[PDB]
Amino acid sequence: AVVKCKPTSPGRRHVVKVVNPELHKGKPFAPLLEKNSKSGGRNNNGRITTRHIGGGHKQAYRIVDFKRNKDGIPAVVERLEYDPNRSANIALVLYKDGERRYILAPKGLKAGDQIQSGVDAAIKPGNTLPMRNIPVGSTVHNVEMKPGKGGQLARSAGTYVQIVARDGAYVTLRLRSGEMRKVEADCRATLGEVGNAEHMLRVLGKAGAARWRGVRPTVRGTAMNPVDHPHGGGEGRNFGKHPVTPWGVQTKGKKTRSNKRTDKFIVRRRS
Amino acid sequence: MKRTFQPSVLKRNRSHGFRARMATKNGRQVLARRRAKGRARLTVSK
Amino acid sequence: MIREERLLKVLRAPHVSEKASTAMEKSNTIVLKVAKDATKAEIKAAVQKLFEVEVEVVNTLVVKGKVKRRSDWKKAYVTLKEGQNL
RNA sequence: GCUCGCCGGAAGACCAAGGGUUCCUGUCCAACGUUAAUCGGGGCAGGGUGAGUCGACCCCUAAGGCGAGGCCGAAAGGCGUAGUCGAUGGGAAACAGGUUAAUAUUCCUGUACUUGGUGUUACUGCGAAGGGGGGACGGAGAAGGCUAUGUUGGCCGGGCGACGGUUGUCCCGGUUUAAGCGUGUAGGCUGGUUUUCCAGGCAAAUCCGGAAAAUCAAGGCUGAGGCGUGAUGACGAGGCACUACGGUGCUGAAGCAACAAAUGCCCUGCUUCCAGGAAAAGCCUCUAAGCAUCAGGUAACAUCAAAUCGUACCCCAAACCGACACAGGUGGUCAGGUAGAGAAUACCAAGGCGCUUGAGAGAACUCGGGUGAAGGAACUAGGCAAAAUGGUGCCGUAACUUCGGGAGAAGGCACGCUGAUAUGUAGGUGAAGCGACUUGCUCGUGGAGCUGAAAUCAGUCGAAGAUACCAGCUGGCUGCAACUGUUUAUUAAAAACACAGCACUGUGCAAACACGAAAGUGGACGUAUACGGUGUGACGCCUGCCCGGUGCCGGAAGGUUAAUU
RNA sequence: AGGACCGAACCGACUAAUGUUGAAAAAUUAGCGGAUGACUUGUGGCUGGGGGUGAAAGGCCAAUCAAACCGGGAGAUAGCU
């Protein structure tokens, strides 16, 4: 549910928060945690390679099962948990042999539900099958791009993928971008959409709320001096030039994809 | 006011010490020049 | 077993001073300017053999040689049990 | 030595960092010290630092560094695996008294504790760079239980007052005691115990995880404080002696209670929240290979070992960083009384100081202050500066609004002391006693004693009672930026930058894009509700027309057009 | 609850005076702003010069910044003094 805070101070006036009472309140499952040290957007050369990254809250990484390999063993959903490493939230599932894992929580999933993976799994939300065994027209998520690699597509909060055609060894998918893509029919997918679709309705409300997600302020190019950005100086507010990136490439329209190795799998580009 | 020199022995040795000079060939060239000049103190190491 | 030669080279000069005499009179503590490498065991055995007394414990300290002269030395507070030394 | 002033959440005390002998004693006064110096952080000589328990080293890991092979790059070299380093973090154990001219948890006295080796005895499954537990973790808030500590009473010792009074609701001082060991309670958490089974924990396990069944929930972990013992010990106001009057030596009373108490402890707790809050070892446990009447493990006892390095002194400063014995800078710990909400402020304690030129004089002028008749912003670029307002309780409070605000709006009134209600009230605490019990660190009941606001009525003093110090000026109309924030270290704090929100555009993951001859790495262990780049800048109402030109995107029939041939 | 409020420490720096061969190569004094946060601070580490870093001022990078410092080319060159 999305909730508006009362304007008891500026910085609270426009805050809209997505509270979920089903999310577990205790600590996460310890065997499935690792440390995740922050980078600041610096590579092994120590240089900023991505701007506007730094600070934010300390985070622990939860190992999420994107492969969904445990075939034929049923699993029950113990609880839904908050995951700070992604927009979706995750589910702790207990397999009948006594091993626990984290998965992306599909839309309708809740504690007590039964999930299964494999060729013979039933066609229900949360179940993982090779796309060869999923009816055409189905809505799936966490889609594999190569058989056995693990899910890569449709992993964010409210995202999903449509299987629109099956032609031999390939299925054609409709991506959230609107792109039509071909993948091998042996790639796995999970039925349903990813839950937490209200994620997009939250409003941060204040500058600090973005600072503690690890985002540093963005300085407009036109506010700098010519030595710092192609949108250089001027006495007052002057632009007089075509918009470009800080490295001089024309943004606002110029296409940048150049991948001839992959062009064979794009049926249609997004529009 | 705060002045530029804010001493710390550990930082001093890690930056300009003997083992730091010996770690790279440029630092090893610093030591050779100082030996050629005949410096009484090769490094900050003490 | 520490060799006799080593023990002969740990004992250098019986320390003579006010605090030295005070300790000897009070807790039977002979004080000795020993070698700066002489370990507690070395001093203990040397005093118990060359001076032929009995040593309770050694309380050695390294004295930083004052500049412009003194080099760095070690003052061993060799507390003896009842064996009267120097 | 006696007075006097000054700091007192510091200008006291203890450290880390840094320094380096500045520390104590004796001698000297050239130079040094903004003067003199007999003095000194100055010179010269001699001393001073004692640790199984404090710290380092050590064990273990973070960021990060380096890195065999390895992958790359004219060379130099870059990156990086196994690994190995790297604290600012996690891993064992000592307290109280006494003592030096200078060292003390180190020496001495008393009373403890930890880890390991080796033997003896008794009983025995032991055994990993491998599995599982544990270590192990955020912010904010609210109790409750305590303690440090304080105040008063009691007790003990002393006193009877330079000037009226002072044998008493009189005055002064002291009423201290630890680690350890024993007990295990205010509180917190969790059902326990057997039996059977197994697609999990790279293999296997008796351990962890999972599934059933039976039977009792009455069990266990954790935990301040109190109490006992330590301790008939030590310390102790003061007396009595020697004396060089430094100072040393001897003896030694009482050593209790009530109330108030933390920001310290229980508490790594509990409740809540979104931004969802290290790692590895020590530690516990499980087995594998292997070992088999061995070796190993457990317990008791005995014995030995715990090395090495630091320890002086300064440490908000004359010992560090500022060229200076420089009005500056500099992280942690402790924190007494009376007022007070307070770690503000005033005055004091313990302690520590009077700031290394003084003496006169009492001109102009300058600085830093006090007060001013009558006016009262006439000043000036401008109320700049000054002056003014200032506390608590209660009454009261407009437009406008995004309904939260505006708002301490504005504006008023009551504040001291004394006495009564009430020889001290409401409240807080709570002893004996009295019962109970699943019988003591128990629970009720009872009210001694202690502590103790606020109010009302009456009276009284000054010109004045938030009497000092401390402590909002208020209102009206407008420009700009929503807002809290950020910036030109050292002339610009702003209307500039940022900002939540909006839009556009790019990107299908070996993503775009960036740093890189490369290898790689960030983005991102993210994946189109995701990321980048650009402009705009909360919110409300909205954003019209123009594709000519210059970009960008798409198309390609035709013209022109490189290497090549 | 709050990038809430008031206000010490703490972190800053709006105004005035003084100082300007300063007590100080930016301070003092009186006021002033924030003070549970986009907060502040200790200790390590990391990014290097056409490079870094920058809530953007040509700010900052050891009192140096529209291209640091040191050494070298080097006795650059100077129709100028």
Residue numbers in the entry:
A (entry chain c): 2 to 272
B (entry chain 6): 1 to 46
C (entry chain t): 1 to 86
From the paper:
Within the wider vestibule region, the uL23 and uL24 loops were shortened to lengths consistent with those present in eukaryotic ribosomes with 7 and 11-residue deletions made within the uL23 (23ΔL) and uL24 (24ΔL) loops, respectively. To further explore a molecular basis for the observed earlier folding mediated by the shortened uL23 and uL24 loops, we used 15N-labelled RNC (L = 37) samples to derive structures of 23ΔL24ΔL 70S ribosomes using single-particle cryo-EM. In silico sorting of the 680,941 particles yielded two major 3D classes comprising of empty 70S ribosomes, and programmed ribosomes harbouring a P-site tRNA-bound FLN5 NC. The 23ΔL24ΔL RNCs were resolved to an average resolution of 2.75 Å, where the truncated uL23 loop is observed at high-resolution (local resolution 3–4 Å at 3σ) relative to the uL24 (local resolution >4 Å, at 1.8σ), which is decidedly more dynamic. There were no other significant structural differences in these ribosomes relative to the WT 70S ribosome, suggesting that the loop modifications only altered the local environment surrounding the site of mutation. The structures of truncated loops in the empty 70S ribosome were identical to those observed in the FLN5 RNC. Following loop truncation, there is a clear increase in tunnel volume (calculated with POVME38) by 1272, 1736 and 3008 Å3 for 23ΔL, 24ΔL and 23ΔL24ΔL ribosomes, respectively. This suggests that the additional free space generated by the truncated uL23 and uL24 loops correlates with the extent of enhanced folding of FLN5 on these ribosomes as shown by NMR. Here, the absence of the uL23 and uL24 loops generates additional space within the tunnel, thereby facilitating a shift of the most probable NC pathway towards the centre of the tunnel relative to WT RNCs, in which the NC’s trajectory is diverted around the two loops. By contrast, the NC ensemble distribution is more symmetric in relation to the centre of the tunnel on 23ΔL24ΔL ribosomes where more contacts are made with H7 and H24 relative to WT RNCs.
